[PDB]
Amino acid sequence: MRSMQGKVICATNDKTVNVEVVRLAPHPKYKRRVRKKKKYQAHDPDNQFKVGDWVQLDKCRPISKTKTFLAVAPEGRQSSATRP
Amino acid sequence: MVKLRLKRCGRKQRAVYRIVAIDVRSRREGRDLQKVGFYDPIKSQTYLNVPAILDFLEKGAQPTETVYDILKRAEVFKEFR
Amino acid sequence: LKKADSAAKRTRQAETRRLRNKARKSEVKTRMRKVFEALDALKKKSGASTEELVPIDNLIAEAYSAIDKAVVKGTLHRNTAARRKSRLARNKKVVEIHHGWY
RNA sequence: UCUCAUGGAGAGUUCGAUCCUGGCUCAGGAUGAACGCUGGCGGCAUGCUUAACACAUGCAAGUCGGACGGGAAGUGGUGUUUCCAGUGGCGGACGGGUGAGUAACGCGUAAGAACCUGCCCUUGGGAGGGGAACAACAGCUGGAAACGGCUGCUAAUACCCCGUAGGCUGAGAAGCAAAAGGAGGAAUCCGCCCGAGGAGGGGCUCGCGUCUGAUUAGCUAGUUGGUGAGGUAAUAGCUUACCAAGGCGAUGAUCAGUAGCUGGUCCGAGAGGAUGAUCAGCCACACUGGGACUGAGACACGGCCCAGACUCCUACGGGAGGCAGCAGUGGGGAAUUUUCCGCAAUGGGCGAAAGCCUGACGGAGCAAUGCCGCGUGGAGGCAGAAGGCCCACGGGUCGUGAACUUCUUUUCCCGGAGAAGAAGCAAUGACGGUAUCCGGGGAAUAAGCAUCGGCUAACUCUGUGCCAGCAGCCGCGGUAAGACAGAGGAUGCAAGCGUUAUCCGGAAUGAUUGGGCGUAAAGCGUCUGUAGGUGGCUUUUUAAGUCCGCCGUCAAAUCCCAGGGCUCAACCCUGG
Ligand SMILES: [Mg+2]
Ligand SMILES: [Mg+2]
Ligand SMILES: [Mg+2]
Ligand SMILES: [Mg+2]
Ligand SMILES: [Mg+2]
Ligand SMILES: [Mg+2]
Ligand SMILES: [Mg+2]
Ligand SMILES: [Mg+2]
Ligand SMILES: [Mg+2]
Ligand SMILES: [Mg+2]
Ligand SMILES: [Mg+2]
Ligand SMILES: [Mg+2]
Ligand SMILES: [Mg+2]
Ligand SMILES: [Mg+2]
Ligand SMILES: [Mg+2]
Ligand SMILES: [Mg+2]
Ligand SMILES: [Mg+2]
Ligand SMILES: [Mg+2]
Ligand SMILES: [Mg+2]
Ligand SMILES: [Mg+2]
Ligand SMILES: [Mg+2]
Ligand SMILES: [Mg+2]
Ligand SMILES: [Mg+2]
Ligand SMILES: [Mg+2]
Ligand SMILES: [Mg+2]
Ligand SMILES: [Mg+2]
Ligand SMILES: [Mg+2]
Ligand SMILES: [Mg+2]
Ligand SMILES: [Mg+2]
Numbered sequence: 001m002r003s004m005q006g007k008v009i010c011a012t013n014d015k016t017v018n019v020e021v022v023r024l025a026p027h028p029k030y031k032r033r034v035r036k037k038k039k040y041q042a043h044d045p046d047n048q049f050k051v052g053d054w055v056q057l058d059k060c061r062p063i064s065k066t067k068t069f070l071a072v073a074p075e076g077r078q079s080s081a082t083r084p
Numbered sequence: 085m086v087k088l089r090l091k092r093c094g095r096k097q098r099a100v101y102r103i104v105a106i107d108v109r110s111r112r113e114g115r116d117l118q119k120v121g122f123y124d125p126i127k128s129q130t131y132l133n134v135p136a137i138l139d140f141l142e143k144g145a146q147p148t149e150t151v152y153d154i155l156k157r158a159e160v161f162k163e164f165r
Numbered sequence: 166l167k168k169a170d171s172a173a174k175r176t177r178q179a180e181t182r183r184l185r186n187k188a189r190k191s192e193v194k195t196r197m198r199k200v201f202e203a204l205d206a207l208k209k210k211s212g213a214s215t216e217e218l219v220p221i222d223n224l225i226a227e228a229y230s231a232i233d234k235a236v237v238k239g240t241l242h243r244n245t246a247a248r249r250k251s252r253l254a255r256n257k258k259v260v261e262i263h264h265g266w267y
Numbered sequence: 268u269c270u271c272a273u274g275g276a277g278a279g280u281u282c283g284a285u286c287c288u289g290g291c292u293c294a295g296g297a298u299g300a301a302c303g304c305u306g307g308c309g310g311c312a313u314g315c316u317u318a319a320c321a322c323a324u325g326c327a328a329g330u331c332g333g334a335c336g337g338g339a340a341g342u343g344g345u346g347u348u349u350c351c352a353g354u355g356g357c358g359g360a361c362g363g364g365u366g367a368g369u370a371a372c373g374c375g376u377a378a379g380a381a382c383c384u385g386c387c388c389u390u391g392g393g394a395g396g397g398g399a400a401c402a403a404c405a406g407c408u409g410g411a412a413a414c415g416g417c418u419g420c421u422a423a424u425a426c427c428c429c430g431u432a433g434g435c436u437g438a439g440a441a442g443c444a445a446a447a448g449g450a451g452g453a454a455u456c457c458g459c460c461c462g463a464g465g466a467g468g469g470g471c472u473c474g475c476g477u478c479u480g481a482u483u484a485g486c487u488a489g490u491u492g493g494u495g496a497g498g499u500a501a502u503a504g505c506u507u508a509c510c511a512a513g514g515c516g517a518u519g520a521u522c523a524g525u526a527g528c529u530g531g532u533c534c535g536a537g538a539g540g541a542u543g544a545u546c547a548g549c550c551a552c553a554c555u556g557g558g559a560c561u562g563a564g565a566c567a568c569g570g571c572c573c574a575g576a577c578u579c580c581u582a583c584g585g586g587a588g589g590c591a592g593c594a595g596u597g598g599g600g601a602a603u604u605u606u607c608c609g610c611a612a613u614g615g616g617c618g619a620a621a622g623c624c625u626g627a628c629g630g631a632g633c634a635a636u637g638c639c640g641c642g643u644g645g646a647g648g649c650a651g652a653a654g655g656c657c658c659a660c661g662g663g664u665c666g667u668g669a670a671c672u673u674c675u676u677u678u679c680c681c682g683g684a685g686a687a688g689a690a691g692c693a694a695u696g697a698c699g700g701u702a703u704c705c706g707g708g709g710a711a712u713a714a715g716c717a718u719c720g721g722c723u724a725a726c727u728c729u730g731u732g733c734c735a736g737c738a739g740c741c742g743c744g745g746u747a748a749g750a751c752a753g754a755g756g757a758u759g760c761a762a763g764c765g766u767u768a769u770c771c772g773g774a775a776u777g778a779u780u781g782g783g784c785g786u787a788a789a790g791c792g793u794c795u796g797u798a799g800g801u802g803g804c805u806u807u808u809u810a811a812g813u814c815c816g817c818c819g820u821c822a823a824a825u826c827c828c829a830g831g832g833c834u835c836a837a838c839c840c841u842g843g
Binding site: 166167168169171172173174175176178179180181182183185186187222225226227228229230231232233234236237239242243244245246247248249250251252253254255256257258 | 328329330351352353354355358359382383401425426434435436437438441442443444445446460496497498499500501560561562563569570571
């Protein structure tokens, strides 16, 4: 709700991981919810993330040019592996 | 610095002022953040809500010459200190 | 007779304050150079010695004196002086940590 | 039989005629308006949209002698005192003007962390002892002038050192850091130094929204990322060395063109479309470019340095300047104002105070530019007449209109009285003898513009003969023209009326609301399939979307409802 989730594609760089964020919002003229995409750059000093993982972002003071976020784990998920 | 003065808004040759607290370097018709009174010389009427004015004076607001006189006729200074 | 000109007066004052501030900054520049030219000489020398740190302890006082006296005047901001003094203390510990003192 | 709903109009033109389809045109409202004809007043507003073209002249930022040394005037050339070129302090980064540039944290909205902040407020502790200079000034000296040069003297809230420290650097040991006095019947206020906070202001980052073009598809190399060393008030490739090869983009990168943004303004049944004058906020620029000093704060409209173009002065060696500040000139253009009064009010800067400055602002003047309001007479006027036009020649119309008779005086003229705005004991008013009130005179001072073929309210006659000419569309005129010109009459408006230009509506004519593709314009020649879009049924999970209840915010002004005040209205104000 507050922060933005995203997929962590292109995690090749050192101490950094490119992240793809997705959101839906209604079109102002026609009122249809369109899936828009926007990328960001975050940092994981432990390098605990790799491509294929699910990651959450947080605001922080700027680390470099265009890298102004911090990668954290997700809060609310629905794994629920094999519940009755 | 914060200051308690009054701006003009009305008709030509009919002055109708309102008291307001704004920055000094801002112009006469500057962006307001709290209107704390109303006044005119012709009709000589005044509302002059005291709870808002004391909030600024505690924080270093300096009235002008006439606003000091308006507040002087009121008993706000005796309760201010 | 000639009249006044307050704008020209600010030009006259600025040149005087410029020479004061220009000289006051260059003092901070040269006194640092005595330190780093020594630390570069003390590092390449393989002979460890505690007595050789006392002249450096004399220059660091001359540096902090020139810097702190400048903060009193209108040249440098207080956070600026902390960065210059920290650069001296930081680079000093490099010789301490590179060698066996730590 | 409740309540909601105050809101959607069409017409002409293709055909011999009809039903459709589809364009063109008109009736509405608005304007920073312009032109044409005409023109009485008052109130509130508005007034270079083009050449961010170039500018004569005057003003637009100064202030403190209760910071300091000197100098001048006056006096009884004696005391008090008045004035200031210079040193020093604060303000000259506010206010004012202009949208050239800018397609992006610039703006709007909603959040954040790694920072600064003079003046104001609050608060904890201090100000001890010494010294050296530049100005002014005095002498000499170079210049046409602007401005200097040399030799010596001097004060300070100006300069320097020592001493002290609840602060700074550092893992620590240790090292470093300040200050100014002034006025005074002496209580004792204005200030100075260090440190911690409050408010306001400013800097930085981020989410969302933010023009057109694919006959611009590849762009970037300090470019994306790190480390180390730097640097900034502070985070940051902000800078640099090395290393890694990433970063942006067909949901439109890059390139090109256009443009200040917003609150809002206009139109619209609404959805939404167009737009960004005045007022208010942010940003940006200051002859064209570049750079830095000063300061708490600038890369500074009326500050400095350099280059370039232009203008002016010159004794030809050398100098001065930047109205996109007020007013005003030239030029451009269809077109937009006095080279005015005043700091009385409001607001701003300096000062302990008295007071000084304030082309901001408050007022006046010009213009029918717009909106609103009131006049250019009311009542009566039997019968009859002159006159214009028309006629079936009997009459009809202009026409109760006029004449005439009484009544009244907004307005007009004359003569008096006369403010509020002023806050502060009194005095202190640019506007201003202004608004306003009383008295006298007397219908006396005041209506024009377009249209009259259909859309579209309003008709005949004369003249002209596809001529002269009208026209928004259809189209009228070729000898009886309701369509041209004149006349009379009528209609619609009214100190305005019409023309032109620009935007919206009508236009469902880009059809989300709200259109269509058999033959009227419109289904790729066909199929397979990537991205993308959508997706059967049943029970659970979560609560992103969605719905409900609260909190904060989207400034004020404007719009909407109510209330009040200007004699009403426009308009102004209060509240929501
Ligand atoms: Mg026909
Ligand atoms: Mg212009
Ligand atoms: Mg003083
Ligand atoms: Mg003086
Ligand atoms: Mg200052
Ligand atoms: Mg000392
Ligand atoms: Mg770069
Ligand atoms: Mg880094
Ligand atoms: Mg432009
Ligand atoms: Mg419509
Ligand atoms: Mg110019
Ligand atoms: Mg300036
Ligand atoms: Mg100028
Ligand atoms: Mg001008
Ligand atoms: Mg004044
Ligand atoms: Mg004043
Ligand atoms: Mg003056
Ligand atoms: Mg006209
Ligand atoms: Mg009559
Ligand atoms: Mg008709
Ligand atoms: Mg005609
Ligand atoms: Mg005829
Ligand atoms: Mg005719
Ligand atoms: Mg439409
Ligand atoms: Mg159709
Ligand atoms: Mg056909
Ligand atoms: Mg066809
Ligand atoms: Mg297929
Ligand atoms: Mg509002």
